[PDB]
Design an enzyme around this catalytic site. Structure first.
Site, PDB file in Angstrom:
ATOM      1  N   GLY A 144     -36.336 -89.570  61.938  1.00  0.00           N
ATOM      2  CA  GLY A 144     -35.173 -90.242  62.486  1.00  0.00           C
ATOM      3  C   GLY A 144     -34.090 -89.257  62.909  1.00  0.00           C
ATOM      4  O   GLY A 144     -33.645 -89.273  64.049  1.00  0.00           O
ATOM      5  N   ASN A 185     -48.529 -90.926  68.378  1.00  0.00           N
ATOM      6  CA  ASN A 185     -49.431 -89.830  68.713  1.00  0.00           C
ATOM      7  C   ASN A 185     -50.890 -90.214  68.511  1.00  0.00           C
ATOM      8  O   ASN A 185     -51.222 -91.370  68.203  1.00  0.00           O
ATOM      9  CB  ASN A 185     -49.060 -88.561  67.974  1.00  0.00           C
ATOM     10  CG  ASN A 185     -49.359 -88.622  66.490  1.00  0.00           C
ATOM     11  OD1 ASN A 185     -50.052 -89.524  66.009  1.00  0.00           O
ATOM     12  ND2 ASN A 185     -48.814 -87.687  65.735  1.00  0.00           N
ATOM     13  N   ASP A 212     -44.620 -72.799  68.565  1.00  0.00           N
ATOM     14  CA  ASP A 212     -44.565 -73.624  67.371  1.00  0.00           C
ATOM     15  C   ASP A 212     -44.430 -75.079  67.809  1.00  0.00           C
ATOM     16  O   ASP A 212     -43.380 -75.469  68.309  1.00  0.00           O
ATOM     17  CB  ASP A 212     -43.391 -73.211  66.495  1.00  0.00           C
ATOM     18  CG  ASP A 212     -43.242 -73.964  65.178  1.00  0.00           C
ATOM     19  OD1 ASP A 212     -44.041 -74.871  64.922  1.00  0.00           O
ATOM     20  OD2 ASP A 212     -42.364 -73.589  64.367  1.00  0.00           O
ATOM     21  N   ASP A 262     -41.011 -85.649  67.841  1.00  0.00           N
ATOM     22  CA  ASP A 262     -39.657 -86.164  67.695  1.00  0.00           C
ATOM     23  C   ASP A 262     -38.769 -85.750  68.863  1.00  0.00           C
ATOM     24  O   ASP A 262     -37.864 -86.484  69.241  1.00  0.00           O
ATOM     25  CB  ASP A 262     -39.060 -85.777  66.359  1.00  0.00           C
ATOM     26  CG  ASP A 262     -39.814 -86.344  65.158  1.00  0.00           C
ATOM     27  OD1 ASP A 262     -40.374 -87.505  65.272  1.00  0.00           O
ATOM     28  OD2 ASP A 262     -39.923 -85.652  64.098  1.00  0.00           O
TER      29      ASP A 262
END
Ligand code: A12
Ligand code: A12
Ligand code: CL
Ligand code: K
Ligand code: K
Ligand code: MG
Ligand code: MG
Lengths: 315, 312
Positions: free
Chosen positions: A42, A186, A250, A256
């Site tokens: 979140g 995903n 990375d 998100d």
């Protein structure tokens, strides 16, 4: 003034230990570095939206503890409203204890902690902010019933719902689908939700259709380096939106970044096609993979190309 | 108030997650509870001694961070002198990240952090306090050079050295033995240090003798529910000191309770026999296993039987 993007969801303190090798069961090992980071799906999504210029508000619960006070400061430093960042003496701030080896492999233990205590009373106090938003974003790192309550409130007020069923639960309440304007997950989540293998864009098209039929208005499945696939009630044929190839440093937190960007576009550029929104969101998330860390990798508007912010469709 | 017990050693923040299952490589799992505890073998030992009534001083280094500030308050709340508790901006406070499943199996990652930056200059500032102490206590959680210097300083002033070679390493500097008046370790440590299998009190006696011949004056091997075994240069025959049977709630930190009790008795009850001191230390450590956590389990004098504090 008014928060256009309201994220009802999780904050987690990342407790990171760097080691040469990962421990097996029973083992005590020494690591060479420890540090604290800010995570939670979140908060991660809210931070990406805020950095793109969204007026955001985080509806969440942390502990009345050092980690919680620090988390509030992290939100303020990202220009996020903290007017609905609640604290509780009854649980510690959520934690992710993360062990990472020199190759970047990890083991993670998440304890949701105070996130699970975000309750109906907290949402009622947030009702005005939720009701006045353009977009309400939620995930599954708080109590599922609380996420369902927030979706319900947003739907009742005609606020666009963006639901990220993460981490996924095999038998989600059917209302999660019917209350989702945009349902974004995903490949590994899609597999759990549908019982299909989802490794490819083709697979994601099949999975997306299953999800659409459960009552979602729009379904998006993200596919890592392959971009994403979308379909909707209006246009039920799957559309594959590729992302340009980059050298990933990375990939942590890319999901998100993607969702936070999509929230930004739904709130500020509602006129745009899904295809346009998703091309832009793909690009932003691909920037994040080219930098180390989660929140630290999320780009700001001032460092991104001007074309990402035009009101009209672009090539 | 002159400190009788000086502990040169580690303070660590314990970051504990309780789970149903331990994670495999690449896995994220969800656990059901997280908590923070004050640990570190040095601090743990110091806290048990202090709670028995010892005037203690903790020589250590933590970070200039929330964990460090909290640690200093923890020491003060336990009536421990923090005159030589240092803070550094160069590393975080030491951490132990601990995952535990419902069967009590664990994965642990220790990052010693600021503890390692306690240096010989830092020690030397404490020389007057060390010189006036009765007992110096060290472990193997800070830099070896620093612990060796502490033991050396104590020896120069005729202060009794109590050394806990924990966690153990196979090829320990020979000086650790020769600088140790009392050398106290557990069964798994004794195995690492000697290469012997220790699966009985008799086996522990054999491992203890190896440690003695490396130059220790007194060797104690703790044996969990079987109590401990002791021998010395003056009495090299192993003596098994049992502990009474209790229902263990949580054995975590029992070794540190035992060592902190022993430090208290060496400092304030010097005329007790070693056997008597070990019986008492066994008893106090067995109280600790009957409560959850590490420092939260260590008993206070006021809650213990009065006979533990009578002389002779
Ligand atoms: N290696 C990579 N190269 C380029 N973009 C990437 C990428 N990995 C992720 N992305 C971008 O980030 C979005 C979300 O990533 P994921 O589908 O990987 C979420 P996860 O499966 O790792 O949790 C993708 O749709 C894409 O836009
Ligand atoms: N299950 C148990 N019952 C009674 N006393 C116990 C016990 N486990 C530990 N103790 C006491 O605590 C002392 C130190 O414990 P250990 O020998 O287990 C060292 P460690 O496992 O904490 O590293 C023992 O010598 C004994 O006095
Ligand atoms: Cl659990
Ligand atoms: K990244
Ligand atoms: K205990
Ligand atoms: Mg990915
Ligand atoms: Mg034990």
């Amino acid at each position: 003034e008014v928060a256009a993007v309201v994220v009802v969801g999780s904050c987690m303190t990342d407790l990171v230990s760097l080691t040469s090798r990962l421990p097996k069961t029973g083992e005590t090992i020494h690591g060479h570095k420890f540090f604290i980071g800010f995570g939670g799906k979140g908060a991660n999504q809210c931070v990406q939206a805020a950095r793109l210029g969204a007026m955001t508000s985080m509806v969440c619960k942390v502990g009345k503890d050092s980690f919680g006070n620090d988390y509030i400061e992290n939100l303020k430093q990202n220009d996020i409203s903290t007017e609905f960042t609640y604290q509780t003496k009854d649980a510690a701030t959520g934690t992710a204890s993360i062990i990472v080896n020199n190759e970047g492999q990890n083991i993670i233990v998440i304890v949701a902690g105070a996130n699970l205590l975000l309750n109906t009373e907290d949402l009622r106090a947030a009702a005005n902010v939720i009701s006045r938003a353009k977009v309400m974003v939620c995930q599954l790192e708080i109590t599922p019933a609380t996420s369902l309550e927030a979706l319900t409130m947003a739907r009742r007020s005609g606020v666009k719902t963006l639901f990220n069923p993460a981490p996924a639960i095999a038998d989600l309440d059917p209302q999660f689908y019917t209350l989702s304007d945009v349902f974004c997950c995903n490949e590994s989540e899609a597999e759990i939700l549908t019982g299909l293998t989802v490794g490819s864009a083709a697979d994601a098209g099949e999975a997306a259709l299953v999800l659409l039929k459960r009552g979602c208005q729009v379904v998006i499945i993200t596919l890592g380096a392959e971009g994403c696939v979308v379909l909707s009630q209006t246009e039920p044929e799957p559309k594959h939106i590729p992302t340009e190839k980059v050298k990933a440093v990375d990939t942590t937190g890319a999901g998100d970044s993607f969702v936070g960007a999509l929230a930004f576009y739904l709130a500020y550029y509602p006129n745009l096609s899904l295809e346009d929104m998703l091309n832009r969101s793909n690009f932003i998330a691909a920037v994040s993979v080219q930098a180390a860390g989660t929140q630290s990798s999320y780009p700001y508007k001032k460092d991104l190309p001007l074309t990402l912010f035009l009101e009209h469709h672009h090539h």
